[PDB]
Amino acid sequence: NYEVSEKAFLLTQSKVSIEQRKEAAEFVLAKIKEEEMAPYYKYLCEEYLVNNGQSDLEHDEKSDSLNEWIKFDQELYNELCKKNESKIKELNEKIQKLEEDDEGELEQAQAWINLGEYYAQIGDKDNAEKTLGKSLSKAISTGAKIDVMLTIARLGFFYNDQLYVKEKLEAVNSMIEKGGDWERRNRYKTYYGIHCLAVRNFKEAAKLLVDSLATFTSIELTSYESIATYASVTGLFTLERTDLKSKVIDSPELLSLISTTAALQSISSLTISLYASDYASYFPYLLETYANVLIPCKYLNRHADFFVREMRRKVYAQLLESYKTLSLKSMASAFGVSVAFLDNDLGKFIPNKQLNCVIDRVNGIVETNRPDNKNAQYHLLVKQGDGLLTKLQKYGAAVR
């Protein structure tokens, strides 16, 4: 269900082109004639409002925005009951006869597991996890448990529900912790970091994506280079510049990945320009980054403007370490900013204690604040040193 999830994701916010939502809408109507996508489109209008929420024919009666092409016509309306008879009335009667004839054990479990995948395309989630629970008691080895954790993971992928799905994803590994091969051991930890990207835990969850996407891909939902853009942007985002030379710019998979398609423009254009300390050509590569990468990708657009605040402070911080004092004519008259427009970027970063820099408003001499031998031994020691008696007397003064 990645095709309808990735392409129709442009229905959230697209400020670039109008045909982006139109071209992606063709894949929605093409894939829905085979398998039922109806519960996916119903949630699109129930998530974001006053943008695309008025395009549904029957939810409430509304017409708005630019898109008349996403809807259920009189054909799919009559096909709504046709798919329900095949996915419920037809399948449940065949499995019910298996319990009466008592044929096999794991074969009956795989029947409920395969049937449980149809409930994801139905839109009733109470019977989705119920059928998986019936096959849970019939599951013996780890072969039948592979598709169980995949169907449960689709509940948060297909319905975009990060609340009730993460409880079931953790319940499988917590009740019985085995993992089998290290391939699945990374799968239980991958789904853990997916729901943490919705709450935006930053480098905690995002550090596992660059490791998993550079080794193995499920290959069933998508391809290797389609979701590779998630690890390309978060690669330089989470990892410091010191380790970018031994990891990102030199990699067996990444250097062969840029030759597959030009839609990345991260591990190549942004990495080489950042390692060369040249910000003249580095910034125009960011112009095609957010547009052609962050917006179309799902988990990347969940952040969007959350990337730059961490990245914009870091790109200048690395330049301040290479010189004691810089010049305003280098920043204002050359690369990324003008004179007056510089106050908007570094103006809000310093009061947040993100970086320490000094700009001269007369002679135009940029000055860098260097802690020298102070560092965390003196100043930062006082800050985090007060937490010793703060956390001790918090619950300690009340005894029991």
Binding site: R200, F202, L286, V308, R309, F341
Partner: peptide
């Protein structure tokens, strides 16, 4: 966690990247 959530506005990408286009044309 939640402090980073609200403090980020609609500014930056959609805005500052539109300024970088006209900035290089004036130089």
């Amino acid at each position: 966690e939640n402090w980073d959530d609200v403090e980020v506005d609609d500014d930056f990408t959609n805005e500052l990247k539109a300024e970088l286009d006209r900035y290089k044309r004036e130089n």
